[PDB]
Design a protein around this ligand. Sequence first.
Ligand SMILES: [Mg+2]
Ligand SMILES: [Mg+2]
Ligand SMILES: [Mg+2]
Ligand SMILES: [Mg+2]
Ligand SMILES: [Mg+2]
Ligand SMILES: [Mg+2]
Ligand SMILES: [Mg+2]
Ligand SMILES: [Mg+2]
Ligand SMILES: [Mg+2]
Ligand SMILES: [Mg+2]
Ligand SMILES: [Mg+2]
Ligand SMILES: [Mg+2]
Ligand SMILES: [Mg+2]
Ligand SMILES: [Mg+2]
Ligand SMILES: [Mg+2]
Ligand SMILES: [Mg+2]
Ligand SMILES: [Mg+2]
Ligand SMILES: [Mg+2]
Ligand SMILES: [Mg+2]
Ligand SMILES: [Mg+2]
Ligand SMILES: [Mg+2]
Ligand SMILES: [Mg+2]
Ligand SMILES: [Mg+2]
Ligand SMILES: [Mg+2]
Ligand SMILES: [Mg+2]
Ligand SMILES: [Mg+2]
Ligand SMILES: [Mg+2]
Ligand SMILES: [Mg+2]
Ligand SMILES: [Mg+2]
Ligand SMILES: [Mg+2]
Ligand SMILES: [Mg+2]
Ligand SMILES: [Mg+2]
Ligand SMILES: [Mg+2]
Ligand SMILES: [Mg+2]
Ligand SMILES: [Mg+2]
Ligand SMILES: [Mg+2]
Ligand SMILES: [Mg+2]
Ligand SMILES: [Mg+2]
Ligand SMILES: [Mg+2]
Ligand SMILES: [Mg+2]
Ligand SMILES: [Mg+2]
Ligand SMILES: [Mg+2]
Ligand SMILES: [Mg+2]
Ligand SMILES: [Mg+2]
Ligand SMILES: [Mg+2]
Ligand SMILES: [Mg+2]
Ligand SMILES: [Mg+2]
Ligand SMILES: [Mg+2]
Ligand SMILES: [Mg+2]
Ligand SMILES: [Mg+2]
Ligand SMILES: [Mg+2]
Ligand SMILES: [Mg+2]
Ligand SMILES: [Mg+2]
Ligand SMILES: [Mg+2]
Ligand SMILES: [Mg+2]
Ligand SMILES: [Mg+2]
Ligand SMILES: [Mg+2]
Ligand SMILES: [Mg+2]
Ligand SMILES: [Mg+2]
Ligand SMILES: [Mg+2]
Ligand SMILES: [Mg+2]
Ligand SMILES: [Mg+2]
Ligand SMILES: [Mg+2]
Ligand SMILES: [Mg+2]
Ligand SMILES: [Mg+2]
Ligand SMILES: [Mg+2]
Ligand SMILES: [Mg+2]
Ligand SMILES: [Mg+2]
Ligand SMILES: [Mg+2]
Ligand SMILES: [Mg+2]
Ligand SMILES: [Mg+2]
Ligand SMILES: [Mg+2]
Ligand SMILES: [Mg+2]
Ligand SMILES: [Mg+2]
Ligand SMILES: [Mg+2]
Ligand SMILES: [Mg+2]
Ligand SMILES: [Mg+2]
Ligand SMILES: [Mg+2]
Ligand SMILES: [Mg+2]
Ligand SMILES: [Mg+2]
Ligand SMILES: [Mg+2]
Ligand SMILES: [Mg+2]
Ligand SMILES: [Mg+2]
Ligand SMILES: [Mg+2]
Ligand SMILES: [Mg+2]
Ligand SMILES: [Mg+2]
Ligand SMILES: [Mg+2]
Ligand SMILES: [Mg+2]
Ligand SMILES: [Mg+2]
Ligand SMILES: [Mg+2]
Ligand SMILES: [Mg+2]
Ligand SMILES: [Mg+2]
Ligand SMILES: [Mg+2]
Ligand SMILES: [Mg+2]
Ligand SMILES: [Mg+2]
Ligand SMILES: [Mg+2]
Ligand SMILES: [Mg+2]
Ligand SMILES: [Mg+2]
Ligand SMILES: [Mg+2]
Ligand SMILES: [Mg+2]
Ligand SMILES: [Mg+2]
Ligand SMILES: [Mg+2]
Ligand SMILES: [Mg+2]
Ligand SMILES: [Mg+2]
Ligand SMILES: [Mg+2]
Ligand SMILES: [Mg+2]
Ligand SMILES: [Mg+2]
Ligand SMILES: [Mg+2]
Ligand SMILES: [Mg+2]
Ligand SMILES: [Mg+2]
Ligand SMILES: [Mg+2]
Ligand SMILES: [Mg+2]
Ligand SMILES: [Mg+2]
Ligand SMILES: [Mg+2]
Ligand SMILES: [Mg+2]
Ligand SMILES: [Mg+2]
Lengths: 122, 218, 227
Amino acid sequence: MIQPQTYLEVADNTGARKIMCIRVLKGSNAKYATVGDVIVASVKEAIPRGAVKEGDVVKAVVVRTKKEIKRPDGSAIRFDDNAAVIINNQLEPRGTRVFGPVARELREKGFMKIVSLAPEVL
Amino acid sequence: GEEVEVHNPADLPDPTRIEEILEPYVKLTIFTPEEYVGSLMQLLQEKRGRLVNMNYLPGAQKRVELVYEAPFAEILYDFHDRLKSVSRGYASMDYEQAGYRPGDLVKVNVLVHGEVVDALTFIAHREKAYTMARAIVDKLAEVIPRQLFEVPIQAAIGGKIIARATVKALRKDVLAKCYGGDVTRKKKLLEKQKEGKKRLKAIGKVEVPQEAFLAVLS
Amino acid sequence: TPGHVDFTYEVSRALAAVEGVLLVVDASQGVEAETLAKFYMALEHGHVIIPVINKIDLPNARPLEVALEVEEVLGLPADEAIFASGKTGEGVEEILEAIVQRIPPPKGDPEAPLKALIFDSVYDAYQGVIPYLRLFEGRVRPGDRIRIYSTGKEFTVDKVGVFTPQGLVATEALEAGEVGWLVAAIRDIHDVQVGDTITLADRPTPSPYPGFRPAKPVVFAGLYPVD
RNA sequence: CCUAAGGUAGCGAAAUUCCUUGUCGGGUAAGUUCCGACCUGCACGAAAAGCGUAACGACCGGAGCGCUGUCUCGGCGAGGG
RNA sequence: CGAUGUCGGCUCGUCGCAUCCUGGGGCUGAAGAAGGUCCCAAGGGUUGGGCUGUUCGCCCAUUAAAGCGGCACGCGAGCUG
RNA sequence: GCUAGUUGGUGGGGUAAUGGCCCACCAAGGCGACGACGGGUAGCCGGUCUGAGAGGAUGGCCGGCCACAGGGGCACUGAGACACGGGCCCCACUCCUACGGGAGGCAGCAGUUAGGAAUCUUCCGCAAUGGGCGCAAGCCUGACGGAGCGACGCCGCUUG
RNA sequence: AGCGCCGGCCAACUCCGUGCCAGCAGCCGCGGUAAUACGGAGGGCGCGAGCGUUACCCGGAUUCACUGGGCGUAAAGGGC
RNA sequence: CCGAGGGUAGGGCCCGUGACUGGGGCGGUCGUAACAAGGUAGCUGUACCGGAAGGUGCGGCUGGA
RNA sequence: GCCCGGAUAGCUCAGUCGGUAGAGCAGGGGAUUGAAAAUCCCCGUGUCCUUGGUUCGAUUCCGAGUCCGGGCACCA
RNA sequence: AAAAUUC
Ligand SMILES: [Mg+2]
Ligand SMILES: [Mg+2]
Ligand SMILES: [Mg+2]
Ligand SMILES: [Mg+2]
Ligand SMILES: [Mg+2]
Ligand SMILES: [Mg+2]
Ligand SMILES: [Mg+2]
Ligand SMILES: [Mg+2]
Ligand SMILES: [Mg+2]
Ligand SMILES: [Mg+2]
Ligand SMILES: [Mg+2]
Ligand SMILES: [Mg+2]
Ligand SMILES: [Mg+2]
Ligand SMILES: [Mg+2]
Ligand SMILES: [Mg+2]
Ligand SMILES: [Mg+2]
Ligand SMILES: [Mg+2]
Ligand SMILES: [Mg+2]
Ligand SMILES: [Mg+2]
Ligand SMILES: [Mg+2]
Ligand SMILES: [Mg+2]
Ligand SMILES: [Mg+2]
Ligand SMILES: [Mg+2]
Ligand SMILES: [Mg+2]
Ligand SMILES: [Mg+2]
Ligand SMILES: [Mg+2]
Ligand SMILES: [Mg+2]
Ligand SMILES: [Mg+2]
Ligand SMILES: [Mg+2]
Ligand SMILES: [Mg+2]
Ligand SMILES: [Mg+2]
Ligand SMILES: [Mg+2]
Ligand SMILES: [Mg+2]
Ligand SMILES: [Mg+2]
Ligand SMILES: [Mg+2]
Ligand SMILES: [Mg+2]
Ligand SMILES: [Mg+2]
Ligand SMILES: [Mg+2]
Ligand SMILES: [Mg+2]
Ligand SMILES: [Mg+2]
Ligand SMILES: [Mg+2]
Ligand SMILES: [Mg+2]
Ligand SMILES: [Mg+2]
Ligand SMILES: [Mg+2]
Ligand SMILES: [Mg+2]
Ligand SMILES: [Mg+2]
Ligand SMILES: [Mg+2]
Ligand SMILES: [Mg+2]
Ligand SMILES: [Mg+2]
Ligand SMILES: [Mg+2]
Ligand SMILES: [Mg+2]
Ligand SMILES: [Mg+2]
Ligand SMILES: [Mg+2]
Ligand SMILES: [Mg+2]
Ligand SMILES: [Mg+2]
Ligand SMILES: [Mg+2]
Ligand SMILES: [Mg+2]
Ligand SMILES: [Mg+2]
Ligand SMILES: [Mg+2]
Ligand SMILES: [Mg+2]
Ligand SMILES: [Mg+2]
Ligand SMILES: [Mg+2]
Ligand SMILES: [Mg+2]
Ligand SMILES: [Mg+2]
Ligand SMILES: [Mg+2]
Ligand SMILES: [Mg+2]
Ligand SMILES: [Mg+2]
Ligand SMILES: [Mg+2]
Ligand SMILES: [Mg+2]
Ligand SMILES: [Mg+2]
Ligand SMILES: [Mg+2]
Ligand SMILES: [Mg+2]
Ligand SMILES: [Mg+2]
Ligand SMILES: [Mg+2]
Ligand SMILES: [Mg+2]
Ligand SMILES: [Mg+2]
Ligand SMILES: [Mg+2]
Ligand SMILES: [Mg+2]
Ligand SMILES: [Mg+2]
Ligand SMILES: [Mg+2]
Ligand SMILES: [Mg+2]
Ligand SMILES: [Mg+2]
Ligand SMILES: [Mg+2]
Ligand SMILES: [Mg+2]
Ligand SMILES: [Mg+2]
Ligand SMILES: [Mg+2]
Ligand SMILES: [Mg+2]
Ligand SMILES: [Mg+2]
Ligand SMILES: [Mg+2]
Ligand SMILES: [Mg+2]
Ligand SMILES: [Mg+2]
Ligand SMILES: [Mg+2]
Ligand SMILES: [Mg+2]
Ligand SMILES: [Mg+2]
Ligand SMILES: [Mg+2]
Ligand SMILES: [Mg+2]
Ligand SMILES: [Mg+2]
Ligand SMILES: [Mg+2]
Ligand SMILES: [Mg+2]
Ligand SMILES: [Mg+2]
Ligand SMILES: [Mg+2]
Ligand SMILES: [Mg+2]
Ligand SMILES: [Mg+2]
Ligand SMILES: [Mg+2]
Ligand SMILES: [Mg+2]
Ligand SMILES: [Mg+2]
Ligand SMILES: [Mg+2]
Ligand SMILES: [Mg+2]
Ligand SMILES: [Mg+2]
Ligand SMILES: [Mg+2]
Ligand SMILES: [Mg+2]
Ligand SMILES: [Mg+2]
Ligand SMILES: [Mg+2]
Ligand SMILES: [Mg+2]
Ligand SMILES: [Mg+2]
Ligand SMILES: [Mg+2]
């Protein structure tokens, strides 16, 4: 359940370490973003010589969340962090690896790029 | 003296010294059919050019042609979306051909607050230049974020003015706490503001950050 | 051919490089102005235009009437133009064979002094640049000089292809009649025009045909970045 | 021209700056506040002291971390009414 | 005037239409898609955050849209100060 | 100005073997303007260039020693390695994958690419010399013998 | 058969072009209408499958002086 | 146990940069300090003062009669 | 807005108490100087801010305006 | 024992 203010740990080699969510991109006034939803976010930590420098404002899709998400078959999955992956408008990663698992729900949501790049899609 | 350049027009030596100019007027051949010629020709009367003759190719009768010399700038703009939208998308042009011009060069300068802007400086026909000038300044107002004084926008060449733009300032505040209403207390706060909407003008250096994709692109 | 206008950058010059161009017309949309305008371009050169009438697979499509229209309108032999349909295995079947014959194959001595002009060029080559054209006359290959007509400036041969449709392929040298590609070190892109290629250095064809050549300033003026 | 003589050092949009969110810089995704600068000081300035100053302060500004029912946005539960 | 408690906020609204959006229209210098202008229309909806006591405004990120007035410039025996 | 395994002791551990090489206790020592400690740079010699000489400068080819084998760490086998073309693990990167998982290591000879002002043939042969295994026959040997390209250096010859 | 040079250092000189322009340059310095110094030509010197340039090392540099220098006034005696 | 390494925190040195701000070198305004007793002999350590060179005090030197 | 004061030579300024107006610097002609200053000699020059009124007559006195300068614009 | 600047 990511909302504006939420720092989420970024899981691709774009060169972002942590980003803060500044809007959840889902209508006139969506309250929360979750797995496979897209935010706008400010960049709070950049390893030196990235492409995303600090204070940049990026779009990113939520890949992992601390708040368990429920699935049609009445199972659930929560992760131990909230993670994101920085994309561009075309909705595709500027990264070239993704780190950690990602949630199956990214798949129907068309983020197929991300899903293959993953180490495990739980 | 004679002088060759420069590609980006603003620089060119002052009308104090300047008795010659060149618009590398080409003349082009357009095949067209039938008559789109009436429409077309007049179009090539605005972007002024020069007829030699040319010929009807045989039919399709709507077969036909026209060889015209027009200055490079006028040609370009005037021509493509128009060129067809005029003729209904048939017809065509090729300009190879690079002649030169003795005609008129007039370039107008665009000034914001009087702080002449170099980037917006533009180059056109004396009649067209005269025509464009209104659009530039007027198209300007949406552009320039507000600074504390009535803010001149004007467009002009060599010391006479083709255009005007004025930008409102108005950094009003002050009366917003008077309520009793001596007429004269109301005035006192605007005697300090009238000095302030002046002092700030004489030391005012003003700026516009990008958004020039907007003002003087068009 | 660059599809679209394109302003004639790839529509004509490269028009030079064909033997026959195949004219493709829908039989659903009809015949459009790009369709006709390109014709006289191509009609302009002198070539074998083999017409087509197309889509026919689409049900509603009006096929015969198109040939009819091009008929008076475009002036092509009504009978001569073929029919296929692309989505279908279609009128295709005769397409290649028809082409060869309607199309006379190329001619020039290929060991004769180099006079090579190529329709077009490879993109980027941030690393290195490649070229296409036909060395209609002559041949050039590795251990070569190249000299390209207007000022020079004289670039040696790294290789030539020739790139099989899979991609850009080998060859010892590029030879006459044959249409391929050549290298290398050009890098400048301003001097080059389609009808100017050189040349080994040590002999020069006396005159370029040509298809040339590029233009003087300025368009543009700044392409200044924001932010 | 004038005065008894015309504000020096240092400081300066300041617990003084009116015009005012002056201008430039810093921080922020965004900064009328804060910090650094400039000096057009409406109307600082030298024991009604001037410019600094380590330590101190339930003083008064600005920022960040940590953590939180302050808040999204509220819910349940205990006792006294 | 033997007393009718002030700006702004919060909370709760309700109403006008001179409509911001959404719905129906005519004209267009309406090809289409997008606009512009006037007409009908008040059913519903009209976001989060930076600065400032602010209302206002500027600015960020979005939005179908980020309407404008009235109700003692609504509302302090409802709160805040 | 530097030092707590730091400097010496003892008794162990370990190795082919001496030693704080490592561990426990014991003592308070060890080093430094004759430049410790930190920082910069560098593979070292035989040699080589210059110079009357002293000196200066340099370490390419070759020969000797050292060190490294994508960046790190670890040991196993073994006379010998903590092993370039053996093994294990982490990191970067490349490839395969049925997504569960896997394979990789040219600073060997050719060669590709990048970087650069600039730098060679995906040649030929085991005929020699040398190496390994084998009773031998032989087999392996991009060491090596030669060829190729470049005026890159020296030397020799031509254009009468 | 080519390449460097032809004011001085440094071996090799005349005409024409240019007029502080164009250009040359290691250093002196050349060029502002008779230029052996710029550009060309004739002529000449050097070296020759080469001849020049750049970069770097030693040399000239007894200019870190051990061989082999200095400090009254040139840089240099410490205020005692 | 150790352990490549990853992570947390606090320091140290270096490089790049920055609104602004010193001075420094190379190509009109104000004066005229030095070079002749340079028109007040100069220089000098120091202090204070002054648009600017500089003036003045205290003491020193001759590299001044 | 109200209150006082101002406006005179190119710049900066005196001044009448109603008749023809001054200074200082700039400017100019001369001199001195090899020359440029400094110095010396000689020289101007004004619609005394605009409008109207008083007056034989107005820079002067009277009324209004424009502009400039100083002060006030408070209790909410 | 020199009032007087500059090219
Ligand atoms: Mg945080
Ligand atoms: Mg991660
Ligand atoms: Mg930052
Ligand atoms: Mg920032
Ligand atoms: Mg009121
Ligand atoms: Mg296409
Ligand atoms: Mg169509
Ligand atoms: Mg004062
Ligand atoms: Mg001061
Ligand atoms: Mg200030
Ligand atoms: Mg401020
Ligand atoms: Mg602001
Ligand atoms: Mg401020
Ligand atoms: Mg700011
Ligand atoms: Mg800022
Ligand atoms: Mg910033
Ligand atoms: Mg910013
Ligand atoms: Mg605040
Ligand atoms: Mg400050
Ligand atoms: Mg003050
Ligand atoms: Mg005070
Ligand atoms: Mg006092
Ligand atoms: Mg203080
Ligand atoms: Mg102190
Ligand atoms: Mg303090
Ligand atoms: Mg206290
Ligand atoms: Mg609560
Ligand atoms: Mg409760
Ligand atoms: Mg209870
Ligand atoms: Mg009352
Ligand atoms: Mg009463
Ligand atoms: Mg009562
Ligand atoms: Mg009451
Ligand atoms: Mg508020
Ligand atoms: Mg209505
Ligand atoms: Mg409307
Ligand atoms: Mg409408
Ligand atoms: Mg409508
Ligand atoms: Mg349209
Ligand atoms: Mg429409
Ligand atoms: Mg409604
Ligand atoms: Mg409403
Ligand atoms: Mg808002
Ligand atoms: Mg904040
Ligand atoms: Mg405001
Ligand atoms: Mg809409
Ligand atoms: Mg309301
Ligand atoms: Mg009330
Ligand atoms: Mg009211
Ligand atoms: Mg109220
Ligand atoms: Mg109350
Ligand atoms: Mg209240
Ligand atoms: Mg009440
Ligand atoms: Mg209060
Ligand atoms: Mg209180
Ligand atoms: Mg111990
Ligand atoms: Mg002890
Ligand atoms: Mg020793
Ligand atoms: Mg090394
Ligand atoms: Mg070397
Ligand atoms: Mg060796
Ligand atoms: Mg290794
Ligand atoms: Mg390894
Ligand atoms: Mg290693
Ligand atoms: Mg063994
Ligand atoms: Mg080893
Ligand atoms: Mg190994
Ligand atoms: Mg290997
Ligand atoms: Mg190799
Ligand atoms: Mg190689
Ligand atoms: Mg390469
Ligand atoms: Mg290269
Ligand atoms: Mg070799
Ligand atoms: Mg052998
Ligand atoms: Mg053998
Ligand atoms: Mg040879
Ligand atoms: Mg020579
Ligand atoms: Mg000689
Ligand atoms: Mg020469
Ligand atoms: Mg001559
Ligand atoms: Mg010479
Ligand atoms: Mg000569
Ligand atoms: Mg030889
Ligand atoms: Mg030397
Ligand atoms: Mg000698
Ligand atoms: Mg020596
Ligand atoms: Mg010697
Ligand atoms: Mg020396
Ligand atoms: Mg000696
Ligand atoms: Mg000496
Ligand atoms: Mg002595
Ligand atoms: Mg001393
Ligand atoms: Mg001393
Ligand atoms: Mg460790
Ligand atoms: Mg560690
Ligand atoms: Mg690790
Ligand atoms: Mg700096
Ligand atoms: Mg710094
Ligand atoms: Mg003097
Ligand atoms: Mg003196
Ligand atoms: Mg003197
Ligand atoms: Mg004097
Ligand atoms: Mg003194
Ligand atoms: Mg002064
Ligand atoms: Mg004095
Ligand atoms: Mg004295
Ligand atoms: Mg005056
Ligand atoms: Mg005079
Ligand atoms: Mg005179
Ligand atoms: Mg003379
Ligand atoms: Mg009068
Ligand atoms: Mg009172
Ligand atoms: Mg009040
Ligand atoms: Mg004198
Ligand atoms: Mg002078
Ligand atoms: Mg003199």
